[PDB]
Symmetry: C5
Subunit: 213 residues, 5 copies
């Protein structure tokens, strides 16, 4: 009930309920099924690209959501949603497999827990990757391939599900960038290695971009 | 009253009361209305500026207020205000939407709590932004916009409001800066996304400045 | 039982068990024998190189395993493995003896504990080293040696066992790098000092690489 | 009693007593008057100077004292002083008002507590400032001024006093700097703002220096 | 004895005894005499040398030992040594008096505690220094002096004593550095200031090095 959203004690009790139920270190696997983690990046900017090193700086909003039904409550007469520090929640152990720098999180480390058990988490992140930035000054542009998946959970435990959607890019990418976006695709992928046969699901995010002009 | 300001025991007890009552993770919505958060940036210095890449590096005192009547106390014969570590208080989850570096806090992380429940928090912050830097070498100057709002609380839950609409920050801006501030305007602004319909309020700050001839 | 892998309560119970049993600060020596730690670096990228100062800046996945049998459980009808924050576990105090920068860990700091007591830990690390960069612009390439071993545990306490394989890390190394890996090999070595006769085992990693 | 300094049990007991009595978050006012804080900067090095940007990068020892006579003990047969982590103590919430970078503390964060309740704190700090570097390469030199005061406590609560008005920091400043110090002067003022009537005290440090030749 | 070194229960009990007994914030003075701290820097690399600014950036292993007999135990049929997190131990508050950057620790922060109560601690540290760099390009090389001592403990509480006085660090220094070490000498030194009477002991490390030709 949105009318009850600003009931302070209601919010405090939901938070208390969330923290009691939450097992921040245990994957929330409903029904003997992998946790489905939906992710999609919204690029905000492309910063220091170096063609002498093949490195780029990106800023993106990591739209991330999953379900934990044990967190659900009755919101007939209480807030529909509250904000919760992620230290009180299980959060998927996502990583950019091919990153070359730490994720620099630029935003308050809070998620939204919806009364149905849905969790929404969208950090703004600056991070460096190794990219093919050779044709960045040409009309065909450059490509970054960013791969994001669970660092330690294989596909029986965590499933990673991407959403490619370029229509709303305009709402996100800075208009003052040295660069423009030709194309973003975010595709579901599976990773295996010679040593280790189990499949790890990831989103492969392809950023095709070039200098304006 | 200010005759009792330096009563050590009083301050200690006020701090104790604040801590017992304070819920650092719950928005202090009094009645059933959004928390009104007032924000005003006083710019202190423009350190670096890149016209080619449209980035700025600035220092600013972020004057921040809101009130939590539950923290209030009768101060006829006690301190009117004390200093409180913000780890003991709720603070709004503000983020600069077009920031490209972590805000670097340069000051003790303390807030002032007033006996009427008003909270004042003014961190000195250094941070980088993507904004319009063109015109910096002209008489008219560049106009750089900085949008700041709550990261996770929509307008039903938090309202952001600019304190001052203008100023030049002459009481604040360094006289030794290679730049000079022409004007600073602060404006209420609203943001929505086509994925997510609820409105998030923000203050949009416009910094009109230029290089010294 | 992999069919039980997703039994949430099972997982939570395993984790609680692991935490009750685990001594994060004590080496898990079994049968009064040294802890065998297998290490394996998989290079992700080589970022910058200075032939004048003999420095390299690299990113690598450090494949690390060891056993702690006291953590073992019967998985007849429960998960085969769980993820565990390494703050809850003993991890070997490994260091690169020729690092000239701090190990910048890029990944979530978790290990896998397997029901037989096996622990797998694989941080992605960016770090700078001092090593031989001569020949980086020749077709033989440079050969940069990186030495990693325990910082405080001598060889009767921790033994380091380099493993397979011999490869150019093709499944791992970025194709977008300005460098190519010719070869990566690993070798067991030992270190002693005239102040300190006890032997410290290390893996010696030889990175043979050149500029494109 | 200096004969008793190395009595371990005594030291431990003193530290226990200090921690039991200490209120790290409460200003140690005595007799309902402002905490008197003595501050003095001993400059060690001037690293980088930029006359275009008016920035300096310096290293100094911040000599800092104040009294909390509640920490005092009878040292007739016990150590005169002990070292205490400052997290176990109240420390003034000092900040450089014209700092453009975080204070980098280079030394163990320890204070000395004296049996008479005197507290001595001296971090080595490297920090960048916005100040006057006009004339760095003249024989008269540049006079860079730094203001340091409490961030959240007005003059009725904390008073900040320079210690020795003038020296040339002979026993401190690196003989290997490419700059030389002509004079350092430290004087009281106060700062007020039209928004905020109450007065904040600070020490204003004037650093007169030039490049050697 | 070493045949019991891998007795896990024993190690655990030793670590438990050490933690029960240890006072990490109190100097381990025995016999009411100053704590004897032995220090020697083994240099690993000389990364950067600046002759215009007289700065030096090095990596060294700070070999450090002292004794706390209260930690001792009977090792007839138990381990002779264990590794201990330095957070559980008292460590001397050492600082480089001419450091201009924070000591960056590159190694696990663990010490060895021997059953006779000796403590060994050897962090690899990367740090920057202001020191005399003139002559680095000559045959005689540069002699860069580094002074390390307790930050808050004077001569009656802590005595710093150089271990080896002369070495070329040939077992430690990288063969791959562009510099080479002619000699490393370490001398006991003492330091006082006009403001403050009592003496502070330190080790003067003279690093005589030059560019390879
Ligand atoms: N553009 C946008 N996208 C999402 C989102 C999130 C998850 C997802 O799977 C898909 C979309 C959420 C979202 N907001 C809410 C929210 C929730 C949590 C953290 C942060 N924010 C609103 C919002 C407005 C303004 C600034 C930041 N967030 N805004
Ligand atoms: N110029 C100025 N503005 C404010 C202020 C704060 C919040 C707000 O909404 C509007 C104005 C407070 C303020 N001071 C007090 C205070 C209080 C809290 C934290 C920090 N400081 C005085 C002050 C002087 C000098 C250095 C820092 N603070 N000074
Ligand atoms: N290539 C690879 N190697 C290993 C590995 C680990 C230890 C060892 O001794 C040898 C090899 C494990 C491993 N994964 C599992 C795991 C486990 C623990 C932490 C992290 N990851 C799968 C995996 C795929 C992709 C991204 C991260 N992990 N992948
Ligand atoms: N030159 C100097 N000045 C002071 C000092 C401090 C406060 C003050 O108001 C005036 C002078 C203290 C002091 N030492 C003692 C002390 C005490 C506490 C922390 C740190 N140090 C001795 C000392 C020697 C050498 C390296 C560091 N300290 N040395
Ligand atoms: N060369 C060397 N010197 C020392 C040492 C230590 C203290 C001292 O006063 C003098 C010398 C100890 C030492 N090791 C053991 C130890 C113990 C503790 C921490 C770290 N290391 C062996 C060792 C081998 C290899 C890599 C690191 N340590 N190695
Ligand atoms: C809780 O939800 C149930 C399910 O619709 C409903 O029957 C009940 O009235 C709700 N509780 C209230 C409104 O207090
Ligand atoms: C509290 O109530 C009023 C102030 O609103 C005042 O008249 C009264 O004396 C106060 N009592 C106290 C401070 O104990
Ligand atoms: C555990 O393992 C034993 C054999 O080691 C097996 O017989 C028993 O059924 C198992 N118990 C469980 C899974 O509870
Ligand atoms: C402190 O103790 C000594 C003896 O223990 C005594 O002589 C002295 O008077 C005491 N001082 C006070 C203030 O009690
Ligand atoms: C204690 O030490 C003595 C001699 O050092 C030895 O005989 C005895 O066995 C030891 N007792 C233990 C380790 O319990």
């Amino acid at each position: 009930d949105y009318k009850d959203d600003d009931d302070k004690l209601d919010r405090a009790d939901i938070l208390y309920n969330i923290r009691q139920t939450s097992r921040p270190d245990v994957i929330p696997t409903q029904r003997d099924r992998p946790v489905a983690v939906s992710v999609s990046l919204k690029f905000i900017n492309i910063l220091e690209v170096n063609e002498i090193t093949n490195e780029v700086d990106v800023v993106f909003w990591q739209q991330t959501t999953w379900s934990d039904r044990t967190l659900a409550w009755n919101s007939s007469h209480s807030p529909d949603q509250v904000s919760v520090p992620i230290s009180s929640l299980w959060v998927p152990d996502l990583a950019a497999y091919n990153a070359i720098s730490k994720p620099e999180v630029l935003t308050p480390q809070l998620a939204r827990v919806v009364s149905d058990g849905e969790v929404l988490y969208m950090p703004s992140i600056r991070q460096r990757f190794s990219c093919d930035v050779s044709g960045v000054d040409t009309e065909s542009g450059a490509t970054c391939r960013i791969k994001i998946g669970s660092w330690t959970h294989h596909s029986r435990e965590i499933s990673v599900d991407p959403t490619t959607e370029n229509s709303d890019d305009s709402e996100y990418f800075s208009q003052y960038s040295r660069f423009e976006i030709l194309d973003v695709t975010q595709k579901k992928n599976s990773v295996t290695y010679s040593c280790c046969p189990e499949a790890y699901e990831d989103v492969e995010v392809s950023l095709n971009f070039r200098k304006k002009g």
